[PDB]
């Protein structure tokens, strides 16, 4: 029961500002339906250009799910910031 | 004219991936306007706590403009990746 | 009272867990001391250079600084992402 | 033998640099240990969870390992930007 | 025809700006070939290595390999925001 | 005499691994020089951009010299990351 009050540095948050986090939970959502569709859009592509050999040396060349991936993790990392922003911890 | 053609390892785009592209763009747009608002709220949040200087401290130790920013550089970054997911430039 | 649970993505927690999550807290306040002990041996390095143009320069285009800053978010956001790791939000 | 003097733009560093240079390091160490801990409670996590589909489903979901692996790398980088605050290489 | 008049933010260029920007593109793939370089260097380190238990474990403790995958993913942001800054998109 | 001896996971280097760290070093003194020179042509846009409100508005929207920096912080950490595969230290 209110575990908050047993984690460091956490302090109680008022409804505004618990709303603004959700917000970003929110956001963050639709972008992990467009990174879905962007991988849905990358497994097709990869599956029609099969035995196209240049084609196929091409998009490996590009690595299209690393990047999917590092931008992935940039938009939840931000995430992060922006609801620690928001809650603003009382620790290091 | 055509300018795309000119920069390295620019690809020709179809409109199926300029759609993609823009439709990241626009989620971007979204996050910009919740960062407005996060920006606007801690500006009333450190106007409301004026000569209350415990509570300036906290704001200032919390650092969260700092994390404002940390957190709008990610964005933004996943972002340009995300849209290379989907562009796939011919270049390292 | 018990806003964890009105944050979405926010499961319950065992004491186990927050334990964790609180001994990584600690561990960046050890962290927190050296930074501010590596910055006062900053400012004591700068103060012993003063009149020295040479030195002077040379500490400004090393940028300690600046690289100071940038070890103390990698930190953080470390801190972050482990504390993640245990906790596990249930939303992107 | 001195092979610092070797590489471009090393400086020699005195007994009070290499020392809080080794502080950062050992602080790491516990990090290191820390992450070890966290990485066995993820193992035996998902091994009390075997044949709970929907407490595997979970865990997979949320990442954690990913996430750890995430945190592990800016605690590593972190330390390499403290390090290069005190070490102050004399190149870009 | 004309794609970059198609993406959102995206403004004519000066010939200029083409020239700085493909600039970064080129010094990036002499950092593609030393990357490749210290990948083959790795392999060849690793293979000599093969039957000696404690340097394998040296070279998989020391994790060369993804270091290097973070070093290049750095280069080719680093690269991005470099050509961001050229370019200067008229969207977050 | 030897510092690097007294660093904690620091291990001898050989000619070809000093050779190849000092191989980065430089490639990435030619790295500086191209954001030096970007850096000027952005002074220069500003500058002829004084008294053209919608320009000056345009460029500072754009955030370059921000871009710029973010670049070059990239660039260098990944250095930092493409030395640490040669030179594998013996700490976390
Ligand atoms: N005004 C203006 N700005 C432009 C134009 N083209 C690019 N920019 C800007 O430069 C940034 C970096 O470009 P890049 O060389 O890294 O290539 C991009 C990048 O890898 C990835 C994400 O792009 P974005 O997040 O929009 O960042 C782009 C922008 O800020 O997609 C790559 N990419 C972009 N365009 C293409 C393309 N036509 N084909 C293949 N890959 C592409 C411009 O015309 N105007
Ligand atoms: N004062 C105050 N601050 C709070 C409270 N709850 C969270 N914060 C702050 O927001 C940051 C980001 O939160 P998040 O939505 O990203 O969820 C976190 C995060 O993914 C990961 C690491 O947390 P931390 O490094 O402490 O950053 C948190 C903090 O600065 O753990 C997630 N997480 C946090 N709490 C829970 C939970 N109860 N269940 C599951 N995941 C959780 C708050 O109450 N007060
Ligand atoms: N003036 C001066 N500066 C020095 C000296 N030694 C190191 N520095 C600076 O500290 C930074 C961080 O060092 P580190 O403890 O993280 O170890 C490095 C790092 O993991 C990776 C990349 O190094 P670099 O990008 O040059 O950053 C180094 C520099 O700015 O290589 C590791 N590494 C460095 N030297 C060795 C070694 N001899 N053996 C094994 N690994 C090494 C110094 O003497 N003078």
Same mark, same amino acid.
């Given at each position: 029961d209110?575990?908050?009050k047993k !984690?460091? /540095?956490?302090? *109680?948050?008022?409804?505004?500002?618990?709303?603004?986090?959700?917000? @970003?939970?929110?956001? /963050?959502?639709?972008?992990?339906? #467009? !990174?879905? *569709? @962007?991988? *849905?859009?990358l497994? &097709?592509?990869?599956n %029609?250009? #099969?035995?196209?050999?240049?084609? =196929? $040396?091409? !998009?490996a060349? %590009?690595?299209? &799910?690393?990047? #999917? %991936?590092? &931008?992935? $993790?940039?938009?939840? $990392? /931000?995430?992060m910031? !922006? =609801?620690? %922003?928001?809650?603003?911890? *009382?620790?290091?």
């Open positions: 209110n575990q908050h !984690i460091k /540095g956490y302090r *109680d948050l008022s409804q505004e500002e618990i709303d603004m986090m959700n917000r @970003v939970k929110e956001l /963050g959502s639709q972008f992990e339906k #467009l !990174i879905q *569709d @962007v991988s *849905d859009h497994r &097709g592509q990869y %029609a250009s #099969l035995h196209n050999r240049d084609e =196929i $040396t091409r !998009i060349n %590009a690595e299209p &799910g690393r990047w #999917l %991936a590092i &931008g992935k $993790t940039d938009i939840q $990392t /931000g995430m910031a !922006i =609801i620690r %922003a928001i809650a603003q911890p *009382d620790s290091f």
